[PDB]
Amino acid sequence: MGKLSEQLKHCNGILKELLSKKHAAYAWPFYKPVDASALGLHDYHDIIKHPMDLSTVKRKMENRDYRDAQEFAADVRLMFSNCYKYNPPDHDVVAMARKLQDVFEFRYAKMPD
Numbered sequence: 001m002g003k004l005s006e007q008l009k010h011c012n013g014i015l016k017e018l019l020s021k022k023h024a025a026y027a028w029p030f031y032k033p034v035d036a037s038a039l040g041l042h043d044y045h046d047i048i049k050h051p052m053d054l055s056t057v058k059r060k061m062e063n064r065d066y067r068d069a070q071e072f073a074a075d076v077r078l079m080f081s082n083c084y085k086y087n088p089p090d091h092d093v094v095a096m097a098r099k100l101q102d103v104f105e106f107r108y109a110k111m112p113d
């Protein structure tokens with residue numbers, strides 16, 4: 001039970017919560033990669049250079065891609081940042097991003113030392 005493993009278990013706990021029924025009402029747009037073509041967002045990949053979503057974070061966690069909590073947090077925040085960059089701030093998806101990021105930031109702050 002080394003510090004990095006321990007901190008990544010906390011990250012995995014957060015990830016499970018973000019994917020849980022508890023938060024499904026505002027988390028669901030972040031479950032899978034933005035389907036730009038399907039949503040008619042033909043400028044999405046010109047504006048967003050590094051797409052990110054919770055399925056990609058889950059795949060990277062399962063594959064032991066993340067070496068520390070900082071790397072995991074950078075992907076979760078990239079996902080939110082992409083949402084805030086692309087969308088007008090009054091879009092429903094931005095309100096949902098804000099709510100899910102509140103869940104993330106408050107639990108991430110409870111990281112074991």
Ligand SMILES: CNC(=O)c1cc(C(=O)N[C@H]2[C@@H]3COC[C@@H]32)cc([C@@H](OC)c2ccccc2)n1
Pocket residue numbers: 029030034039041082083086087088091092093096
């Ligand atoms: C991470 N997801 C997104 O950023 C996103 C963007 C847009 C969308 O159209 N963005 C266009 C900008 C520019 O032009 C106007 C806004 C739509 C969706 C939908 O996901 C299924 C959706 C539909 C309803 C509620 C929540 C999310 N997600």
